[PDB]
Design an enzyme around this catalytic site. Structure first.
Site, PDB file in Angstrom:
ATOM      1  N   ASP A   7       0.837  -1.191   0.000  1.00 57.66           N
ATOM      2  CA  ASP A   7       0.000   0.000   0.000  1.00 57.66           C
ATOM      3  C   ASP A   7       0.893   1.271   0.000  1.00 57.66           C
ATOM      4  OD1 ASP A   7      -1.897   2.010   0.448  1.00 57.66           O
ATOM      5  OD2 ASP A   7      -2.498   1.252   2.414  1.00 57.66           O
ATOM      6  N   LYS A  68       1.982  11.331  -4.455  1.00 58.20           N
ATOM      7  CA  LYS A  68       0.889  10.579  -5.030  1.00 58.20           C
ATOM      8  C   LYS A  68      -0.125  11.515  -5.711  1.00 58.20           C
ATOM      9  CE  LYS A  68      -2.373   6.852  -3.765  1.00 58.20           C
ATOM     10  NZ  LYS A  68      -2.669   5.837  -2.693  1.00 58.20           N
ATOM     11  N   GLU A 173      -6.985  -0.258  -4.671  1.00 56.00           N
ATOM     12  CA  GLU A 173      -7.031  -0.229  -3.201  1.00 56.00           C
ATOM     13  C   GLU A 173      -8.291  -0.869  -2.592  1.00 56.00           C
ATOM     14  OE1 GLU A 173      -6.017   3.948  -2.495  1.00 56.00           O
ATOM     15  OE2 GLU A 173      -3.966   3.634  -3.213  1.00 56.00           O
ATOM     16  N   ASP A 197     -12.989   4.414   3.136  1.00 56.40           N
ATOM     17  CA  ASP A 197     -11.534   4.552   3.315  1.00 56.40           C
ATOM     18  C   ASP A 197     -11.186   5.996   3.731  1.00 56.40           C
ATOM     19  OD1 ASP A 197      -8.710   4.780   3.089  1.00 56.40           O
ATOM     20  OD2 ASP A 197      -8.548   3.764   1.183  1.00 56.40           O
TER      21      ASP A 197
HETATM   22  N1  LIG Z   1      -6.377   5.659  16.826  1.00 50.69           N
HETATM   23  C1  LIG Z   1      -6.652   6.636  15.947  1.00 50.69           C
HETATM   24  N2  LIG Z   1      -7.680   7.501  16.159  1.00 50.69           N
HETATM   25  C2  LIG Z   1      -7.925   8.478  15.271  1.00 50.69           C
HETATM   26  N3  LIG Z   1      -7.185   8.640  14.141  1.00 50.69           N
HETATM   27  C3  LIG Z   1      -6.164   7.828  13.831  1.00 50.69           C
HETATM   28  C4  LIG Z   1      -5.826   6.754  14.736  1.00 50.69           C
HETATM   29  N4  LIG Z   1      -4.760   6.088  14.203  1.00 50.69           N
HETATM   30  C5  LIG Z   1      -4.448   6.700  13.033  1.00 50.69           C
HETATM   31  N5  LIG Z   1      -5.289   7.741  12.821  1.00 50.69           N
HETATM   32  C6  LIG Z   1      -5.239   8.636  11.671  1.00 50.69           C
HETATM   33  O1  LIG Z   1      -5.081   7.886  10.487  1.00 50.69           O
HETATM   34  C7  LIG Z   1      -4.524   8.800   9.513  1.00 50.69           C
HETATM   35  C8  LIG Z   1      -3.579   8.022   8.599  1.00 50.69           C
HETATM   36  O2  LIG Z   1      -4.341   7.128   7.815  1.00 50.69           O
HETATM   37  P1  LIG Z   1      -3.711   6.179   6.677  1.00 50.69           P
HETATM   38  O3  LIG Z   1      -4.837   5.309   6.183  1.00 50.69           O
HETATM   39  O4  LIG Z   1      -2.481   5.504   7.244  1.00 50.69           O
HETATM   40  O5  LIG Z   1      -3.311   7.262   5.539  1.00 50.69           O
HETATM   41  P2  LIG Z   1      -3.372   7.079   3.914  1.00 50.69           P
HETATM   42  O6  LIG Z   1      -4.618   7.885   3.628  1.00 50.69           O
HETATM   43  O7  LIG Z   1      -2.125   7.673   3.301  1.00 50.69           O
HETATM   44  O8  LIG Z   1      -3.598   5.593   3.602  1.00 50.69           O
HETATM   45  C9  LIG Z   1      -3.851   9.924  10.304  1.00 50.69           C
HETATM   46  O9  LIG Z   1      -4.590  11.147  10.231  1.00 50.69           O
HETATM   47  C10 LIG Z   1      -3.957   9.454  11.723  1.00 50.69           C
HETATM   48  O10 LIG Z   1      -4.051  10.522  12.652  1.00 50.69           O
END
Ligand SMILES: Nc1ncnc2c1ncn2[C@@H]1O[C@H](COP(=O)(O)OP(=O)(O)O)[C@@H](O)[C@H]1O
Length: 381
Positions: A7, A68, A173, A197
């Site tokens: 990913d 991206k 995805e 997502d």
């Molecule tokens: N326990 C949590 N509670 C709330 N938000 C979270 C938690 N863990 C991660 N996040 C949020 O998830 C986001 C990252 O998401 P991710 O899916 O890894 O990004 P991408 O969109 O690049 O795939 C960040 O804003 C982070 O703050």
């Protein structure tokens, strides 16, 4: 040899591997299973992931992220021109309308295409997998958004090759997430799957139908500038106003350090509030030697972000409306993206689907990499 699933995310990336005939999601050196999609260049080094992200304020012109949003696109695209106004790094137009990121690195000006930045992130994912598995890795499935076009896909494949990966396939995805839950091998006849997502910076909803184990992407919708960062911003804002109210109108955003430290703890407060009902910020010598502390409730967090959280249900309606499907017809609602951990967001979605339990047994920021890796293994043997 062995094959992996990556990913390649807008803000974070994640990699899955195959050990003992199942899927393992690989921790980075911070013990995290997601690595920021950040690269930075200095006079003596280049940094990837957390190290890159952590020094951004000290070296903002040469710290690259959001590649991206450029990959496979043209320089004078409107989205590109809009995004460029929010990036501290320079983007100029290369020959044939291709964007070029221009930075300083090892004492000279250096130019990179977006796929070269993404190759560095992919190379990192490849390295951590190689350490984890104890062997060289070449074969990979890399995922992309369902809406990516031929040019965006090819540029992602190219990022793969540049990183030394043989990209066996580029898959979508939301499909990878569906594959991770075995949804293409669950039940009889046609199965409707909604993927919700919500990440750090982007929001995508995808409606898929599966039949005889074949995936069709029926409809996509979303917002490319809604995610976890915007929720952080709201918490910050609240704190800024609270501080004034306590200190005769003194504005903290006037000082940079005070803001970084505040933004850092707001992110942590937000995470904490996904498993507790209260979070504390406490920062010594914040602005003018003024100490700052505040108790933030979950209800307050939900209140600061109420509009955003409601706004996530509109793309769910759009994909259903576009596909001529009733929300009742969806058999699986899959939560993907780290922001889906927010209880209120889960409650809104579950309410929208009349109390149906979402698929959330796989870490939502790992589901995509997981499905990528299953697919890598099938294509690998
Ligand atoms: N326990 C949590 N509670 C709330 N938000 C979270 C938690 N863990 C991660 N996040 C949020 O998830 C986001 C990252 O998401 P991710 O899916 O890894 O990004 P991408 O969109 O690049 O795939 C960040 O804003 C982070 O703050």
């Amino acid at each position: 040899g062995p094959a992996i699933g990556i990913d390649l995310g807008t803000t974070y990336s994640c990699v899955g591997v195959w050990r003992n005939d199942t899927v393992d999601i690989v921790p980075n050196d911070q013990g995290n299973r997601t690595t920021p999609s950040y690269v930075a260049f200095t006079e003596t080094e280049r940094l990837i992931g957390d190290a890159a992200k952590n020094q951004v304020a000290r070296n903002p012109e040469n710290t690259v992220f959001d590649a991206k949003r450029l990959i496979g696109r043209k320089f004078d695209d409107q989205a590109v021109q809009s995004d460029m106004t929010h990036w501290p790094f320079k983007v100029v137009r290369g020959p044939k309308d291709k964007p070029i990121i221009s930075v300083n690195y090892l004492g000279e000006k250096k130019e990179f295409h977006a796929e070269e930045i993404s190759a560095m992130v992919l190379q990192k994912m490849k390295e951590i997998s190689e350490a984890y598995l104890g062997r060289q890795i070449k074969n990979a499935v890399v995922t992309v958004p369902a809406y990516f076009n031929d040019s965006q896909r090819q540029a992602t494949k190219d990022a793969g090759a540049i990183a030394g990966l043989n990209v066996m396939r580029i898959i979508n995805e939301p499909t990878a997430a569906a594959i991770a839950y075995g949804l293409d091998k669950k039940g009889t006849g046609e199965r409707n799957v909604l993927i919700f997502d919500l990440g750090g910076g982007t929001f995508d909803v995808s409606l898929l139908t599966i039949e005889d184990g074949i995936f069709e992407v029926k409809a996509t919708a979303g917002d490319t500038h809604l995610g976890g960062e915007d929720f952080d911003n709201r918490l910050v804002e609240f704190c800024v106003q609270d501080f004034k109210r306590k200190n005769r109108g003194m504005d903290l955003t006037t000082n940079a350090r005070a803001l970084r430290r505040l933004r850092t703890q707001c992110e942590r407060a937000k995470r904490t509030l996904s498993s507790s009902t209260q979070a504390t910020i406490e920062l010594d010598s914040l602005y003018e030697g003024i100490d700052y502390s505040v108790a933030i409730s979950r209800a307050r967090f939900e209140e600061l972000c109420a509009d955003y959280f409601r706004a996530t249900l509109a793309p769910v309606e759009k994909v259903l409306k576009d596909a001529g499907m009733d929300k009742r017809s969806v058999h699986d609602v899959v939560l993907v993206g780290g922001s889906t951990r927010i209880p209120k967001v889960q409650a809104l979605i579950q309410e929208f689907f009349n109390g149906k339990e979402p698929c959330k047994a796989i870490n939502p920021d790992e589901a995509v990499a997981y499905g990528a890796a299953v697919q890598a293994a099938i294509l690998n043997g």
